[PDB]
Amino acid sequence: GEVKKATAEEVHARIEFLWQREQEKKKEQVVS
Amino acid sequence: GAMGTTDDVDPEAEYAAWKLRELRRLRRERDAIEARERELAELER
Amino acid sequence: GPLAPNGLNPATIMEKAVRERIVESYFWKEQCFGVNEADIVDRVVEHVRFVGGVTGVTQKPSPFLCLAFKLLQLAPGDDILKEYLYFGGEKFKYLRALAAFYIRLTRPDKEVYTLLEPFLEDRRKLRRKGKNGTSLTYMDEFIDDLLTKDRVCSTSLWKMRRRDILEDLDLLEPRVSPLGSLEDILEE
Numbered sequence: 001g002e003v004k005k006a007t008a009e010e011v012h013a014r015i016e017f018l019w020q021r022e023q024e025k026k027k028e029q030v031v032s
Numbered sequence: 033g034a035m036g037t038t039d040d041v042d043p044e045a046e047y048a049a050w051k052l053r054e055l056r057r058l059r060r061e062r063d064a065i066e067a068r069e070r071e072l073a074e075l076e077r
Numbered sequence: 078g079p080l081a082p083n084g085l086n087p088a089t090i091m092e093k094a095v096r097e098r099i100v101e102s103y104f105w106k107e108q109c110f111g112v113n114e115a116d117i118v119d120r121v122v123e124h125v126r127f128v129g130g131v132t133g134v135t136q137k138p139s140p141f142l143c144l145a146f147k148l149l150q151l152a153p154g155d156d157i158l159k160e161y162l163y164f165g166g167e168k169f170k171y172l173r174a175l176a177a178f179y180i181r182l183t184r185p186d187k188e189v190y191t192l193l194e195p196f197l198e199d200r201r202k203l204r205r206k207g208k209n210g211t212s213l214t215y216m217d218e219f220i221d222d223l224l225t226k227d228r229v230c231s232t233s234l235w236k237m238r239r240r241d242i243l244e245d246l247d248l249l250e251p252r253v254s255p256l257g258s259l260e261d262i263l264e265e
Contacts, residue, residue: 006114008156012164014115018122019168022033034126034171036204037213050200053217054256057197 079152081183085235087149090182095231098131099138099146108140109147114157118165118172120144125171127204127211128178128219130231139206141175142230148179162192170201174219178230181223186237187248189224194252196220207231 006014039046081087091099099105108120121144129139158176166173177193184192197217205214207230222229227236243249254260 003111003113005151006116006157008154008160011115011118011157011160014118015160015165015168018118022122034122034169035202036127036171037202039201046200046202050215050217051256053215054197054254055260057221058254058257058260 081152082188083183083185083235085183087152087183090149091146091232095131095138095142096146098136099143102138102143104138104140105143105146109143112147114151114153117144117148117151117153117175118161118169121165121172121175122169125175127206128171128174128214128230129206130229132206139230141171141178142232144175145178145182145230145232148175149182152183153179162196166196166199170199170203170216173199174203174216177220177223178232181229181234182232187243189237190240190243190249193220193223198255 078086078088081090104124108124112120120140124140125144127139128141130142131138158180161172161176162180166176173196177196180192181189197220199216199220201216203214203216203219205212205219223234227234240249240252244251
């Protein structure tokens with residue numbers, strides 16, 4: 001039931017992912 | 033992005049405001065040093 | 078119970094009152110549950126819209142402050158903090174703010190200065206809430222506050238040696254402002 005500790009690479013990937021998601025959301029709002 | 037307020041609306045003005053802020057910081061540092069200098073100058077002679 | 082790079086104990090860094098207000102808060106129970114460093118990034122981009130300590134008539138601890146406390150709990154390594162600062166900070170400013178705040182809380186003065194001083198050139202707008210209502214601030218103002226003030230976001234900042242002291246012991250290089258170079262010419 002413990003929580004896994006994130007690696008620098010994992011956090012990096014998370015940042016990139018959120019960045020992509022946000023930009024995509026902006027594209028969806030401009031397209032809509 | 034969570035922007036507290038949108039950036040890059042008026043880059044000239046925003047940069048100018050930053051320039052003013054940093055200038056004020058330099059103002060504070062220099063004024064502090066000058067104050068100490070006046071204190072020692074007065075006390076020593 | 079690991080201790081920070083500086084002398085301080087992570088549990089005691091924030092006031093007992095502030096800790097209690099955070100843990101009792103809805104945002105801590107709802108949004109800080111099961112959270113890790115990547116999840117810290119998630120909560121930052123999702124829920125952080127201003128920097129502050131406890132605010133309002135309800136003395137509500139900010140999501141910012143709560144995530145700071147969660148960072149104290151996690152005690153992230155320097156590499157992850159670098160990820161926050163540079164990659165996260167370049168992309169998400171409030172993440173940089175959070176990282177700077179945490180570093181100021183838990184890193185040696187030399188590290189604090191060397192890490193945080195470059196972001197005095199970061200002029201991106203931030204939302205600042207708390208003392209004297211709600212106002213607009215900037216990243217460099219926040220950094221300056223971290224470097225020069227005793228208290229930030231309802232958190233007492235441990236006293237650091239003066240920068241000149243660190244320079245004299247050759248632990249630090251003199252800080253170079255671009256405006257300093259312009260200013261030398263202006264004063265003459």
